mmCIF file of C-alpha atoms (C1' of nucleotides) and ligand atoms in Angstrom:
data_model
loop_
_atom_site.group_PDB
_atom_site.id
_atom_site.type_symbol
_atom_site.label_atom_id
_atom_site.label_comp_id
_atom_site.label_asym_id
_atom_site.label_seq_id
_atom_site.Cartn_x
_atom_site.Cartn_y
_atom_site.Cartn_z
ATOM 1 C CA UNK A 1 25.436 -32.029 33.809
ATOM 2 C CA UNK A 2 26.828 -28.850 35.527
ATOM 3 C CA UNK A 3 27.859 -29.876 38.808
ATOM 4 C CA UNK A 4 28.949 -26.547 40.190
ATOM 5 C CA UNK A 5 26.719 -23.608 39.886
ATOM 6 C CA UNK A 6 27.462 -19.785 40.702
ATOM 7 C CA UNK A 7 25.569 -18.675 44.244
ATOM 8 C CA UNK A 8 25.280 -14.971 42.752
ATOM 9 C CA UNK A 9 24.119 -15.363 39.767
ATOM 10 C CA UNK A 10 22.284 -17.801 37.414
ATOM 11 C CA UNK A 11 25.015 -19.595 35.642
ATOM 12 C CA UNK A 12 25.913 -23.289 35.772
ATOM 13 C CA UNK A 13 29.430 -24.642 34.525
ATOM 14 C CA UNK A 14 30.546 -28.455 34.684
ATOM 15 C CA UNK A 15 33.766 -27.811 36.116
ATOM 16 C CA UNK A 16 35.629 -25.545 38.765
ATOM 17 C CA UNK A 17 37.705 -24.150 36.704
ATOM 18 C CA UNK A 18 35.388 -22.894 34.568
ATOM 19 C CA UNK A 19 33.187 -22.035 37.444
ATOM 20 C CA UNK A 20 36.282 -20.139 38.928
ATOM 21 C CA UNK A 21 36.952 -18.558 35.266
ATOM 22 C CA UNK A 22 33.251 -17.515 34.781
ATOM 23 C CA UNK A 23 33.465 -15.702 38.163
ATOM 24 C CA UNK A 24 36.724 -13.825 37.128
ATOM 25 C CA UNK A 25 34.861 -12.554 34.411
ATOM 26 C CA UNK A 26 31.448 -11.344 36.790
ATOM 27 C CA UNK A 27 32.375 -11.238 40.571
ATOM 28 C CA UNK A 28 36.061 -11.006 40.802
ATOM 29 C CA UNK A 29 37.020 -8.794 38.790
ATOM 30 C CA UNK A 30 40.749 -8.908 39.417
ATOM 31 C CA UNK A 31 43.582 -7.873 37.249
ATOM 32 C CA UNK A 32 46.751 -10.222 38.278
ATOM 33 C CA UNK A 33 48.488 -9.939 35.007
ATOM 34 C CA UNK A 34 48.312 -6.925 32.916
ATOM 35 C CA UNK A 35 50.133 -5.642 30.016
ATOM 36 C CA UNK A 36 53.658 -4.195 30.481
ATOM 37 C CA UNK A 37 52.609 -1.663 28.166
ATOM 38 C CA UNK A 38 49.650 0.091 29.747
ATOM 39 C CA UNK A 39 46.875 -0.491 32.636
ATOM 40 C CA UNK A 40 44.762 -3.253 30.502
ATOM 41 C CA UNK A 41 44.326 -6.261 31.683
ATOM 42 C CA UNK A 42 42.519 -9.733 31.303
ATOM 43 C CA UNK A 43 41.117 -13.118 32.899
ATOM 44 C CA UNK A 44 42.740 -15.709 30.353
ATOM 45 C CA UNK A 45 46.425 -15.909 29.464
ATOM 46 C CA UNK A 46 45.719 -15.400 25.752
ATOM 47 C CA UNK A 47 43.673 -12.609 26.190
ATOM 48 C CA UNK A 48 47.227 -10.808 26.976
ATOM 49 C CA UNK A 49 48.460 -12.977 24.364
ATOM 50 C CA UNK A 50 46.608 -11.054 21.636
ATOM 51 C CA UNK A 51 47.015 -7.854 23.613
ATOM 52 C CA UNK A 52 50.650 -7.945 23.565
ATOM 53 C CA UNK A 53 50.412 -8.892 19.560
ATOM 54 C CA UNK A 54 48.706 -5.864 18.968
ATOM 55 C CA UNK A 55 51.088 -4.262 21.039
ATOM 56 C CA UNK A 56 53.645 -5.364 18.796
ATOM 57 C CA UNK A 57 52.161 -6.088 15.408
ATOM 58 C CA UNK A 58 52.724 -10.148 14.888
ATOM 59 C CA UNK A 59 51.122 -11.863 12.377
ATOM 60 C CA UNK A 60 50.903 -15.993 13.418
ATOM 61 C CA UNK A 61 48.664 -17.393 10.591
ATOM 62 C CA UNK A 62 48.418 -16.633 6.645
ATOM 63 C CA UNK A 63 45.666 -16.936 4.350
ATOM 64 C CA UNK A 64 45.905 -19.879 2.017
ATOM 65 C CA UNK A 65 44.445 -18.340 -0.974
ATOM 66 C CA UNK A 66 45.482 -14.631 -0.512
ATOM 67 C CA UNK A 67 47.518 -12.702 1.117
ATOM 68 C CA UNK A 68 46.513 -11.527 4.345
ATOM 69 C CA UNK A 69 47.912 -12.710 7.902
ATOM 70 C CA UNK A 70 45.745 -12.530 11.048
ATOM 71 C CA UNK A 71 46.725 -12.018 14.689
ATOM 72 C CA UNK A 72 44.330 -14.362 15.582
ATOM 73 C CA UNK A 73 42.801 -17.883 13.935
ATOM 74 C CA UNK A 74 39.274 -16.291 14.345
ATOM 75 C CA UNK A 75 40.047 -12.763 12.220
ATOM 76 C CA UNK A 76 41.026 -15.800 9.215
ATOM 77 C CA UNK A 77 38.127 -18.049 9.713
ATOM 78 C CA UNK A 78 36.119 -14.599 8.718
ATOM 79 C CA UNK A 79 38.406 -13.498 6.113
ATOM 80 C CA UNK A 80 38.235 -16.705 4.350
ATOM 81 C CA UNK A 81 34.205 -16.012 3.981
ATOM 82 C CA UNK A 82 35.604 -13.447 1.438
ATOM 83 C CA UNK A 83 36.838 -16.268 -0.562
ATOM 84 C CA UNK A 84 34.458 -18.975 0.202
ATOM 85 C CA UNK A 85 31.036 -16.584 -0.001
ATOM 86 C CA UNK A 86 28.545 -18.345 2.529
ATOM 87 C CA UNK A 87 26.867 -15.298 4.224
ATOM 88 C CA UNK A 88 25.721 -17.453 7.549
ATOM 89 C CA UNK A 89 23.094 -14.292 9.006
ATOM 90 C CA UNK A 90 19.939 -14.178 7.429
ATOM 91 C CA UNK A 91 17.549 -11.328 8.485
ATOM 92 C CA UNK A 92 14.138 -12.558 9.108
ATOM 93 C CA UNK A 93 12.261 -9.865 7.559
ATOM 94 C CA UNK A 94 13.690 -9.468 4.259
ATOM 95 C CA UNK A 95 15.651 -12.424 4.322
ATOM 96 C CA UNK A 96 18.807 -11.069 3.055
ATOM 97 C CA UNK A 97 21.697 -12.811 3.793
ATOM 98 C CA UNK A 98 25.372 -11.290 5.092
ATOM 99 C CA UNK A 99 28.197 -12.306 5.630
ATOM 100 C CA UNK A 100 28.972 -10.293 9.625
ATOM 101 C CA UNK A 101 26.570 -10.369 12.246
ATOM 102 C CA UNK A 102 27.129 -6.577 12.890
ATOM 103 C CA UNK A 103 26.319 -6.155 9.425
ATOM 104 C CA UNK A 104 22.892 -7.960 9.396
ATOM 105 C CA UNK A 105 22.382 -6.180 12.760
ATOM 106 C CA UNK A 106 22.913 -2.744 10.935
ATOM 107 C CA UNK A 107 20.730 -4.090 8.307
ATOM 108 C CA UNK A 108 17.672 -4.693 10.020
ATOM 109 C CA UNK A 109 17.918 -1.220 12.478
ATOM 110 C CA UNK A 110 18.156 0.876 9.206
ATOM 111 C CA UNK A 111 16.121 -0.775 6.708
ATOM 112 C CA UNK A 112 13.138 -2.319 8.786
ATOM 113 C CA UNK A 113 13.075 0.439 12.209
ATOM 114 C CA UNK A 114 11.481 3.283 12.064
ATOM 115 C CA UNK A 115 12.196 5.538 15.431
ATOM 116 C CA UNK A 116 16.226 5.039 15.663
ATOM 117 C CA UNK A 117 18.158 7.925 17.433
ATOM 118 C CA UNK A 118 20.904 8.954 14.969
ATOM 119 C CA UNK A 119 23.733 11.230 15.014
ATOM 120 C CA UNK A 120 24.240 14.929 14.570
ATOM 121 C CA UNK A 121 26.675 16.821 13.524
ATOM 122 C CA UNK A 122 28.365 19.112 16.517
ATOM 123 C CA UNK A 123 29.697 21.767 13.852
ATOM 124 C CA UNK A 124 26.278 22.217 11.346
ATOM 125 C CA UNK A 125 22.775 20.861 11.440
ATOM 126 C CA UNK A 126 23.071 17.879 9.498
ATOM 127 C CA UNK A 127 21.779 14.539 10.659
ATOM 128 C CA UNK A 128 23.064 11.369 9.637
ATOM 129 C CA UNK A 129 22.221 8.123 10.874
ATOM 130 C CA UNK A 130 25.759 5.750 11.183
ATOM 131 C CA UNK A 131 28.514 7.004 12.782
ATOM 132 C CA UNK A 132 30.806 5.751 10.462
ATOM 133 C CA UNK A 133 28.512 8.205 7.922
ATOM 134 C CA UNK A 134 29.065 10.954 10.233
ATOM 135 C CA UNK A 135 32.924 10.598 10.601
ATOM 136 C CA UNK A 136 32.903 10.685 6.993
ATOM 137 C CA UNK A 137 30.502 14.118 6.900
ATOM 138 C CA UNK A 138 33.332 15.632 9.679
ATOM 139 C CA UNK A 139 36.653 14.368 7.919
ATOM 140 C CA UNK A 140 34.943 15.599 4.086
ATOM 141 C CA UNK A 141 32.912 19.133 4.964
ATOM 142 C CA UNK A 142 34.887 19.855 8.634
ATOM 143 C CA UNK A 143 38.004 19.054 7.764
ATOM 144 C CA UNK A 144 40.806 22.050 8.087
ATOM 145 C CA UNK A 145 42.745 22.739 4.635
ATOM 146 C CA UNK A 146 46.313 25.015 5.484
ATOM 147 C CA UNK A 147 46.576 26.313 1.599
ATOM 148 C CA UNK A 148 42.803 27.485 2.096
ATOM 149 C CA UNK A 149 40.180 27.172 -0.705
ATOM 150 C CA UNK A 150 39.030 30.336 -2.848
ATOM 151 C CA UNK A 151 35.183 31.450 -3.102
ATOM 152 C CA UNK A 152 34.298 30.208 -7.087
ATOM 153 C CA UNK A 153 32.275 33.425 -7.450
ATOM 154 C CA UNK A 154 34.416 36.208 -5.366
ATOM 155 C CA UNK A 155 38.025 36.556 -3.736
ATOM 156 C CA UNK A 156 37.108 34.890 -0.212
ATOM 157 C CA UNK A 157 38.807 32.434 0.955
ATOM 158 C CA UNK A 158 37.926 29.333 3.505
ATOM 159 C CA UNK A 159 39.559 26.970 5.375
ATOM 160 C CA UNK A 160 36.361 24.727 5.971
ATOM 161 C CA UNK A 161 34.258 22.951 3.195
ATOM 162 C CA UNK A 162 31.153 23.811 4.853
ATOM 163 C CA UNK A 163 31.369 27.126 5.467
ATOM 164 C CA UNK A 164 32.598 27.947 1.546
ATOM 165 C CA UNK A 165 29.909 25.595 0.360
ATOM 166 C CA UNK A 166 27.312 27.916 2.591
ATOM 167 C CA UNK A 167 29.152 31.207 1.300
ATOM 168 C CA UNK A 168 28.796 30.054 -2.754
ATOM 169 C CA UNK A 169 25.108 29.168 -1.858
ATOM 170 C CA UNK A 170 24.313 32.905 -1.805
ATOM 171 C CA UNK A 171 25.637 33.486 -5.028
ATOM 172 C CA UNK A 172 22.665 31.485 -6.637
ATOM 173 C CA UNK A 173 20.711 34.617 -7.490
ATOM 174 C CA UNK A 174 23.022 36.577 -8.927
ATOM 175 C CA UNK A 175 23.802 37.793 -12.655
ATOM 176 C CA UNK A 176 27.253 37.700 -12.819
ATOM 177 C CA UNK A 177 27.645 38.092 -16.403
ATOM 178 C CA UNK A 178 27.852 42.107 -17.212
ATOM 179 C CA UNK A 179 28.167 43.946 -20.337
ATOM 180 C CA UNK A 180 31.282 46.447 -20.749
ATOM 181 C CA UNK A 181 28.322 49.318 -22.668
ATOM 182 C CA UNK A 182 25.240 49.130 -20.501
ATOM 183 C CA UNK A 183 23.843 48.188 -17.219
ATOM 184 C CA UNK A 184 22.417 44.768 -19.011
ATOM 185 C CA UNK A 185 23.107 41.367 -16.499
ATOM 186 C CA UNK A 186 22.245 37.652 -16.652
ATOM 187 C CA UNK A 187 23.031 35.051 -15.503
ATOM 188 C CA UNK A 188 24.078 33.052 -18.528
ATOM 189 C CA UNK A 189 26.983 33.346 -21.253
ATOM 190 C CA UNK A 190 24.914 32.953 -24.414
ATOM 191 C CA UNK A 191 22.427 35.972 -22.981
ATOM 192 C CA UNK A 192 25.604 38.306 -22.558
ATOM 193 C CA UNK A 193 26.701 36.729 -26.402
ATOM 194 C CA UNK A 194 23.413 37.836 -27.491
ATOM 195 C CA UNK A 195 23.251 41.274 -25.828
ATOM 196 C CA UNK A 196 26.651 42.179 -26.988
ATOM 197 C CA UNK A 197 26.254 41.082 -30.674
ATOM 198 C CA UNK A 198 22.918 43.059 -30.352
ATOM 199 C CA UNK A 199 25.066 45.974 -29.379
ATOM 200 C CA UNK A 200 27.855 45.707 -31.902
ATOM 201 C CA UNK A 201 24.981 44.655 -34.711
ATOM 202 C CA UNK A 202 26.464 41.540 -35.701
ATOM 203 C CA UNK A 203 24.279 39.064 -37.072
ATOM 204 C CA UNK A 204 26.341 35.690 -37.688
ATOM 205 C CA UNK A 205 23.070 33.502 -38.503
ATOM 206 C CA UNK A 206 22.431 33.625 -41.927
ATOM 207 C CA UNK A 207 19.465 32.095 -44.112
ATOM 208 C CA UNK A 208 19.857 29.496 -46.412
ATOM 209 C CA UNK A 209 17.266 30.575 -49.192
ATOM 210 C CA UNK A 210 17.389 34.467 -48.925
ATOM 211 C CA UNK A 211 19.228 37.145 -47.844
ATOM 212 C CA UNK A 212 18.239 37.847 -44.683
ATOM 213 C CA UNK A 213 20.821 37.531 -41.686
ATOM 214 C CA UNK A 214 19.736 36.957 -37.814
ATOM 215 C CA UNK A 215 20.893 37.780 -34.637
ATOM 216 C CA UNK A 216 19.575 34.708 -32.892
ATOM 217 C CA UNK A 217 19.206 31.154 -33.837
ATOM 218 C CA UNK A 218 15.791 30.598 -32.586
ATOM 219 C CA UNK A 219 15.203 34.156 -34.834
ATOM 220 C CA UNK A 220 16.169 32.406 -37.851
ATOM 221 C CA UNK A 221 14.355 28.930 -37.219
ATOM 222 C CA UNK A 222 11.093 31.322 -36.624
ATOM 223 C CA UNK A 223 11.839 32.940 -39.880
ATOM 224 C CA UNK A 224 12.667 29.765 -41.931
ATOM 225 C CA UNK A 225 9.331 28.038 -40.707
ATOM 226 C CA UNK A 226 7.274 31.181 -41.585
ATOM 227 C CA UNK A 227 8.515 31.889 -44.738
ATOM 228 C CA UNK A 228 9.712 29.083 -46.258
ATOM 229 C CA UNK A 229 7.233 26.215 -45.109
ATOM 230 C CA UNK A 230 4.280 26.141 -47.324
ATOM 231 C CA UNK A 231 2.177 23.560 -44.964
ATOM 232 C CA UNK A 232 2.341 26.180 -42.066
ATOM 233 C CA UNK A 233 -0.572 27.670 -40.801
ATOM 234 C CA UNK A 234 -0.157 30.202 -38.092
ATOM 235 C CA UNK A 235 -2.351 29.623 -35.045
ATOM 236 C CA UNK A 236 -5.656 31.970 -34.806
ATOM 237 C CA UNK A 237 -7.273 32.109 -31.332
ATOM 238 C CA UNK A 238 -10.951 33.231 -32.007
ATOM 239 C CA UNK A 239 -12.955 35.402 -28.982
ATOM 240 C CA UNK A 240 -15.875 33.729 -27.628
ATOM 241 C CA UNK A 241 -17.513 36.473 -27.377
ATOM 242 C CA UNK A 242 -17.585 38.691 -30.254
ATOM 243 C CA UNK A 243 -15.825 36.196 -33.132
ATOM 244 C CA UNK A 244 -12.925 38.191 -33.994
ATOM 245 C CA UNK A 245 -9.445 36.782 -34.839
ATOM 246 C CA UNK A 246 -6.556 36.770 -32.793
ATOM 247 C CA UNK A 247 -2.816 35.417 -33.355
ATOM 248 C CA UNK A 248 -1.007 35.816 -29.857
ATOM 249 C CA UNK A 249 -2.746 33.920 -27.184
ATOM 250 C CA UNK A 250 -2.486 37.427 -24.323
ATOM 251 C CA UNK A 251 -4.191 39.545 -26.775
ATOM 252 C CA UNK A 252 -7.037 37.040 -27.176
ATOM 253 C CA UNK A 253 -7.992 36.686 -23.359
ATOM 254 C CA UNK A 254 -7.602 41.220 -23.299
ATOM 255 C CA UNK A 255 -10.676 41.079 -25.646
ATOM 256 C CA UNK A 256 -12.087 38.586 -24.467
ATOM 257 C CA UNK A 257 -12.241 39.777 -20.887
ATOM 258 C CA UNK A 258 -13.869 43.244 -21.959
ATOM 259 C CA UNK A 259 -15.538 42.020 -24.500
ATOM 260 C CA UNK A 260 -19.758 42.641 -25.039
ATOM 261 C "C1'" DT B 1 44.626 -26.938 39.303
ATOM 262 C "C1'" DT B 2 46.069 -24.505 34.838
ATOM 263 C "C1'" DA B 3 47.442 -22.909 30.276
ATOM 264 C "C1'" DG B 4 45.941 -23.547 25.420
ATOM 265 C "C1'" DC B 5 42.741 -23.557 21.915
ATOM 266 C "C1'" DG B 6 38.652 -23.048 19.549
ATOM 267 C "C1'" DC B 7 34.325 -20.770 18.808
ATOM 268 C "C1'" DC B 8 31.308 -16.848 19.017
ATOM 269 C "C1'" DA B 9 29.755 -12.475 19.750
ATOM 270 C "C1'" DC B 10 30.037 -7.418 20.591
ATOM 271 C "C1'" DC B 11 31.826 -2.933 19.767
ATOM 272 C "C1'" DT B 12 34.069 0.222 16.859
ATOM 273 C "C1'" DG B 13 35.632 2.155 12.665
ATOM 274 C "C1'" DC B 14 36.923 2.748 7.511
ATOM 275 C "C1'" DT B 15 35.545 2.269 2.493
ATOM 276 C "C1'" DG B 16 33.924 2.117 -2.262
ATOM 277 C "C1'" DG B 17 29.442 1.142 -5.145
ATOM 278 C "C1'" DT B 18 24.380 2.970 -5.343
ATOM 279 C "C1'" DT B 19 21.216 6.245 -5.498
ATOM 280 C "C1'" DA B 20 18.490 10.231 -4.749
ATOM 281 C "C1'" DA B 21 18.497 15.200 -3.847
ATOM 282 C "C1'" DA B 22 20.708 19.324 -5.602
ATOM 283 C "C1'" DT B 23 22.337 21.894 -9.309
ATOM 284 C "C1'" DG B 24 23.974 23.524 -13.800
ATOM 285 C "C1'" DT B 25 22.629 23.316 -19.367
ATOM 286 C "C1'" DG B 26 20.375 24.383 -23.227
ATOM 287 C "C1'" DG B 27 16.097 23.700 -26.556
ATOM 288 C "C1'" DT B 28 12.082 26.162 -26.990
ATOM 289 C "C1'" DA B 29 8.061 28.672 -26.104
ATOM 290 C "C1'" DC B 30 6.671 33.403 -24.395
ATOM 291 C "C1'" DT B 31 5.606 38.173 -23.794
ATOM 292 C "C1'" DG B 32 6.899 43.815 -24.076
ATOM 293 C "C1'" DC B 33 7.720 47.066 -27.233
ATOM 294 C "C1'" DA B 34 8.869 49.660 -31.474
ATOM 295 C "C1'" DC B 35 7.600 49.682 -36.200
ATOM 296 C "C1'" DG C 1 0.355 41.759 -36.587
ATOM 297 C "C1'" DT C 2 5.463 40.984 -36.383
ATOM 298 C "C1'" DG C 3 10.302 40.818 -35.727
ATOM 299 C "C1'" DC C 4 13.691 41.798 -32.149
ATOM 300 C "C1'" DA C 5 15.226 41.396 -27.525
ATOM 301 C "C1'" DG C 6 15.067 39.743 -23.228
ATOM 302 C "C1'" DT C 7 12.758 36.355 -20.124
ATOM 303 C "C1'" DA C 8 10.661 32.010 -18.422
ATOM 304 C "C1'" DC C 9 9.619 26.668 -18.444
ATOM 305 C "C1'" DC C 10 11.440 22.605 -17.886
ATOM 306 C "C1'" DA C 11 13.238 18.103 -19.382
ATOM 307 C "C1'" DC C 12 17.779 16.610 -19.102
ATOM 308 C "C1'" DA C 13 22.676 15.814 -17.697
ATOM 309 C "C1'" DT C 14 26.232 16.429 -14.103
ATOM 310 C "C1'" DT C 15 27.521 16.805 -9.259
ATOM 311 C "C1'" DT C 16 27.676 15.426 -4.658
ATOM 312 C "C1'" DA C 17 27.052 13.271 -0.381
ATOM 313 C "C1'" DA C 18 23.976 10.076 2.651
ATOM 314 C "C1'" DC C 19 22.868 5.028 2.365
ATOM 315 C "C1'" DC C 20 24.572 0.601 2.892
ATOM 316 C "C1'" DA C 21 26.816 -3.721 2.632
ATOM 317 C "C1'" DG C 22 31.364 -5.232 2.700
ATOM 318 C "C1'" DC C 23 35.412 -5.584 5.459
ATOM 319 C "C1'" DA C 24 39.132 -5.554 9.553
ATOM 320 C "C1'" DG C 25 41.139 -4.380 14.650
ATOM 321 C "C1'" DG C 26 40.481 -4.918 20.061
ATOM 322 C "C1'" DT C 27 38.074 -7.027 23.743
ATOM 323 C "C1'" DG C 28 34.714 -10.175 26.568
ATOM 324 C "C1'" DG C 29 32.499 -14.873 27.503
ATOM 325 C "C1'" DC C 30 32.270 -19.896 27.462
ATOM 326 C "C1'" DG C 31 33.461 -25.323 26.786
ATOM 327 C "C1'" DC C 32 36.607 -28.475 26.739
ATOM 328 C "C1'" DT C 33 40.945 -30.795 26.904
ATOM 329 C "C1'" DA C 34 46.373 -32.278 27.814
ATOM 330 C "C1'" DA C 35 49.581 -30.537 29.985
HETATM 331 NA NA1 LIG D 1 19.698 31.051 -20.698
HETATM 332 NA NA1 LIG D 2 33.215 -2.666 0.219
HETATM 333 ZN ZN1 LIG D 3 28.572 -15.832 38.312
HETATM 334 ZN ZN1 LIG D 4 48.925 -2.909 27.043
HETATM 335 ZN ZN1 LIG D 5 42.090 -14.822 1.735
HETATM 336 ZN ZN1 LIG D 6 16.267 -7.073 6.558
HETATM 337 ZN ZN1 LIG D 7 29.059 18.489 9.510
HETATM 338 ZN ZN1 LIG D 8 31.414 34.224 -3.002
HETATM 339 ZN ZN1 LIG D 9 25.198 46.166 -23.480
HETATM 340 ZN ZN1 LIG D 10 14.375 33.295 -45.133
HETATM 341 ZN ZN1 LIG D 11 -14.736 39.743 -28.243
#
DNA sequence: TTAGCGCCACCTGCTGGTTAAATGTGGTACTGCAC
DNA sequence: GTGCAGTACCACATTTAACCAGCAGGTGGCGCTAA
């Protein structure tokens, strides 16, 4: 039951050699063997193992069911979760279950934390909370584009999403629709249609049981439910004051205010 | 002693489905004015 | 009062990007063995 213990610190192993390997890793510190490749360097021969896999790109074990092959037995036994299910973590709050630590780690600081420090953005003032999220925001709205991208609503052009989505932004009060006879603008199509059909005096709307033509739909539907529904009854707003009728609601309240 | 192996975690980073804020559409009242 | 013309609400349908769980690559720590 541990024989040897560290003097420095508080660990206990049962053997020297994992004594001896356990102060490698904390009071040693030494780097006998590196990798030919760069400066790195580890405490256990297949640490470099791995290293120098990376280094190279070999593949020692396949997936039985699909078709992935992992440097390492580990990276497998995790893949094969994707097969098998069985989410071991379980947060202890909302008791979800998943199938990475890291993942039920991310889980709890950003669904059950309040006060956690997030990221922001170094080139506009968003905030975001992953970092993941915010290389996303940078490689999306930062990115550079060569061929450049055209304002929708005028002839500048941008190289950077954000800046041409904050350039179109201040086109949002604006009537860009203009008739050709007058100084008339909006901001729709169908009031230009309208404007321009008042102009030329067309009247395409036509009713059904007479023959009078419109300008407007809603014109005609106004018509057609005057004249030609015999349950109508046209709304009469009454004064409180003096008793007299009224039909538009405005006129009503003018009397009414000056009224005796 | 010592390398190998197995397990486990930590850190980092990418990625599609989900959803909520933002935004564009169009039906329908709603007034100002000329008659 | 009313019809025309232009405007104003606003519920609704898209649009878009953060949110978030699902994944994989590189490294650090430990517990045993067989070699
Ligand atoms: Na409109
Ligand atoms: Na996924
Ligand atoms: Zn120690
Ligand atoms: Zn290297
Ligand atoms: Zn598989
Ligand atoms: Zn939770
Ligand atoms: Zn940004
Ligand atoms: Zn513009
Ligand atoms: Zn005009
Ligand atoms: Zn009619
Ligand atoms: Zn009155």
């Amino acid at each position: 039951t541990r024989p040897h213990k560290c003097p420095d610190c508080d660990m206990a192993f049962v053997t020297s050699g994992e004594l001896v390997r356990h102060r490698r890793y904390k009071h040693t510190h030494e780097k006998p063997f590196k990798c030919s490749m760069c400066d790195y360097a580890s405490v256990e021969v297949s640490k470099l193992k791995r290293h120098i896999r990376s280094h190279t790109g070999e593949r020692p074990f396949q997936c039985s069911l699909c078709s992935y092959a992992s440097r390492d037995t580990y990276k497998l036994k995790r893949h094969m979760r994707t097969h098998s299910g069985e989410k071991p973590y379980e947060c202890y709050i909302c008791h979800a279950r998943f199938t990475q630590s890291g993942t039920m780690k991310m889980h709890i600081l950003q669904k059950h934390t309040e006060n956690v420090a997030k990221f922001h953005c170094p080139h506009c003032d968003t905030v975001i909370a992953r970092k993941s999220d915010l290389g996303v925001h940078l490689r999306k709205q930062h990115s550079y584009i060569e061929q450049g991208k055209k304002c929708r609503y005028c002839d500048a052009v941008f190289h950077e999403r954000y800046a041409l989505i904050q350039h179109q932004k201040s086109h949002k009060n604006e009537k860009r629709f203009k008739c050709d006879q007058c100084d008339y603008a909006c901001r729709q199509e169908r009031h230009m249609i309208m404007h321009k059909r008042t102009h030329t005096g067309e009247k395409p709307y036509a009713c059904s049981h007479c023959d009078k033509t419109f300008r407007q739909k809603q014109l005609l539907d106004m018509h057609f439910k005057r004249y030609h529904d015999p349950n109508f009854v046209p709304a009469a707003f009454v004064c409180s004051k003096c008793g007299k009728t009224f039909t538009r609601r405005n006129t009503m309240a003018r009397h009414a205010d000056n009224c005796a």
